[PDB]
């Protein structure tokens, strides 16, 4: 899962994202709550209105964590250990919802970067979002 060919792809592409990570972080989330309303049940104490600031704040924390995983592709389970505890032990989020985010993250990288979002990069980004969701739910 995740050849060396796959890691170039993710890295190169994250380079281009650069300063927009957190801005995409938020948009993907507003898209997730928005197509998969069920995901909203995990944020009942949030303000979830379009463009809510609290989401943008959350959107940023997700992106940094994603940047975090990009820099430890070789051992995700260690890097992310503290995050799987939160998501598996404390909140206990059904593994289905991860599919919904990872999907909308992809749709997010596609609205913004059509040039870089070539099928090979699409394939790579997927195994990456998927590889991450696996660590956070185990």
């Amino acid at each position: 899962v995740l050849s060396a060919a796959d890691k170039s792809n993710v890295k190169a592409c994250w380079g281009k994202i650069g300063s927009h990570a957190g801005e995409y972080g938020a948009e993907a989330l507003e898209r997730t709550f928005c197509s998969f309303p069920t995901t909203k049940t995990y944020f009942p104490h949030f303000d979830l209105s379009h463009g809510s600031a609290q989401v943008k704040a959350h959107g940023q924390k997700v992106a940094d964590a994603l940047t975090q995983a990009v820099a430890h592709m070789d051992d995700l389970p260690t890097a992310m250990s503290a995050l799987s505890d939160l998501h598996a032990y404390k909140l206990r989020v059904d593994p289905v919802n991860f599919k919904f985010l990872s999907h909308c993250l992809l749709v997010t990288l596609a609205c913004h970067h059509p040039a870089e979002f070539t099928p090979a990069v699409h394939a790579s980004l997927d195994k990456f979002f998927s590889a991450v969701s696996t660590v956070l739910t185990s």
Binding site: T38, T41, Y42, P44, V93, D94, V96, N97
Partner: peptide, 9 residues
């Protein structure tokens, strides 16, 4: 849904 926030999964 509204009182309970139970993910239907």
């Amino acid at each position: 849904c509204d009182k309970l926030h139970v993910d239907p999964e």
